[PDB]
């Protein structure tokens, strides 16, 4: 019969049925309007759901054996067909490996750190309403069962992201973003960075830290409210889940494991300010009503842009807020580059 090349698009105008099936599955999942080759699972929205069950759909519909690094890590949709119609060769370091590129070979790259959640693939809709598919990659990976993920976690987490960062270069402007516990995280690292002998040039960080003093992390015995914990745990439990049904109380044990030792161990984290160029977002929706400034404008770091919206960290990951900071982060991004405003 010999080999064929099964032909191997570079996206649009799949094959017969080797992409047909694959295309499908994704427009039948969550693509709801997708026909490509060149898809990319993360801004399709994949997920331990989603990519559960297109991966084993496929699985079911070529006969083979597809998942593991196989689905939204390996290549794309094209490469996906020709995996489980031809075969794998092929090796793609899946989501289980330390880092996972979901972007590389555009042009400005975008290093997302301090996803203070399970996986790091939810982003996509922000890194989609800003830039049209620019290089972005985010340093996440699963948890089976993290011995040092309980409280040293911040020092192995710390090694892989600046390990791939000095992997791409030594030193130079680099774009990153915190959420949650981005604000710790993102200090340590930055001073880490100064110090190292880089220079950065705007690091996003969003939570929570109105103009007074630290948060309540300060002390989770006194500052673990049974809202904060609640809430976080029922969006993460209520989007991991997502009354699907595909782990039982592995991927659950790993989530509720994974915020409570994280915002546990938030409490003995490091906390040291940068004097460089960082966004701090307030979050007036839990405004701890005792706020009182005295012309302060913001000392910590030497120039910085406070915002005001009352927003929560618990919901602050959600479709809604991504999409609101759409257009508002090319101006910002824009006007803290470089110089001063130019609009």
């Given at each position: 019969?010999?080999?064929?090349?099964?032909?191997?698009?570079?996206?649009?105008?799949?094959?017969?049925?080797?992409?047909?099936?694959?295309?499908?599955?994704?427009?039948?999942?969550?693509?709801?309007?997708?026909?490509?080759?060149?898809?990319?699972?993360?801004?399709?929205?994949?997920?331990?759901?989603?990519?559960?069950?297109?991966?084993?759909?496929?699985?079911?519909?070529?006969?083979?054996?597809?998942?593991?690094?196989?689905?939204?890590?390996?290549?794309?949709?094209?490469?996906?067909?020709?995996?489980?119609?031809?075969?794998?060769?092929?090796?793609?370091?899946?989501?289980f490996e330390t880092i996972?590129?979901?972007?590389?070979?555009?042009?400005?790259?975008?290093?997302?750190?301090?996803?203070?959640?399970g996986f790091a693939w939810?982003?996509?809709?922000?890194?989609?309403?800003?830039?049209?598919?620019?290089?972005?990659?985010?340093?996440?990976?699963?948890?089976?069962?993290?011995?040092?993920?309980?409280?040293?976690?911040?020092?192995?987490?710390?090694?892989?992201?600046?390990?791939?960062?000095?992997?791409?270069?030594?030193?130079?402007?680099?774009?990153?973003?915190?959420?949650?516990?981005?604000?710790?995280?993102?200090?340590?690292?930055?001073?880490?960075?100064?110090?190292?002998?880089?220079?950065?040039?705007?690091?996003?960080?969003?939570?929570?830290?109105?103009?007074?003093?630290?948060?309540?992390?300060?002390?989770?015995?006194?500052?673990?409210?049974?809202?904060?914990?609640?809430?976080?745990?029922?969006?993460?439990?209520?989007?991991?889940?997502?009354?699907?049904?595909?782990?039982?109380?592995?991927?659950?044990?790993?989530?509720?494991?994974?915020?409570?030792?994280?915002?546990?161990?938030?409490?003995?984290?490091?906390?040291?300010?940068?004097?460089?160029?960082?966004?701090?977002?307030?979050?007036?929706?839990?405004?701890?009503?005792?706020?009182?400034?005295?012309?302060?404008?913001?000392?910590?770091?030497?120039?910085?842009?406070?915002?005001?919206?009352?927003?929560?960290?618990?919901?602050?990951?959600?479709?809604?807020?991504?999409?609101?900071?759409?257009?508002?982060?090319?101006?910002?991004?824009?006007?803290?580059?470089?110089?001063?405003?130019?609009?």
């Amino acid at each position: 019969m010999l080999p064929e090349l099964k032909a191997q698009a570079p996206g649009r105008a799949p094959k017969a049925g080797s992409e047909t099936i694959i295309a499908a599955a994704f427009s039948s999942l969550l693509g709801c309007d997708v026909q490509d080759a060149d898809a990319d699972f993360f801004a399709l929205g994949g997920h331990a759901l989603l990519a559960m069950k297109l991966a084993a759909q496929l699985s079911r519909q070529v006969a083979r054996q597809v998942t593991p690094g196989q689905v939204m890590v390996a290549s794309t949709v094209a490469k996906l067909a020709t995996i489980i119609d031809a075969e794998e060769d092929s090796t793609r370091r899946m989501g289980f490996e330390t880092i996972l590129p979901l972007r590389e070979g555009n042009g400005p790259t975008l290093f997302c750190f301090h996803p203070a959640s399970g996986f790091a693939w939810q982003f996509s809709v922000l890194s989609r309403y800003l830039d049209p598919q620019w290089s972005i990659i985010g340093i996440q990976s699963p948890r089976p069962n993290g011995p040092m993920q309980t409280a040293a976690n911040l020092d192995e987490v710390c090694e892989a992201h600046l390990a791939t960062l000095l992997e791409q270069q030594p030193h130079g402007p680099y774009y990153l973003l915190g959420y949650s516990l981005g604000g710790t995280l993102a200090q340590g690292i930055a001073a880490r960075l100064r110090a190292r002998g880089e220079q950065v040039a705007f690091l996003g960080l969003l939570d929570t830290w109105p103009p007074e003093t630290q948060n309540w992390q300060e002390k989770e015995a006194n500052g673990l409210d049974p809202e904060v914990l609640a809430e976080i745990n029922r969006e993460r439990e209520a989007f991991l889940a997502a009354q699907q049904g595909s782990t039982s109380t592995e991927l659950f044990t790993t989530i509720e494991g994974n915020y409570a030792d994280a915002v546990r161990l938030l409490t003995t984290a490091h906390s040291v300010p940068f004097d460089g160029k960082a966004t701090l977002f307030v979050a007036e929706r839990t405004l701890q009503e005792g706020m009182s400034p005295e012309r302060a404008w913001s000392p910590w770091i030497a120039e910085l842009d406070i915002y005001r919206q009352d927003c929560a960290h618990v919901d602050i990951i959600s479709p809604g807020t991504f999409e609101k900071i759409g257009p508002i982060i090319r101006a910002t991004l824009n006007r803290l580059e470089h110089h001063h405003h130019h609009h």
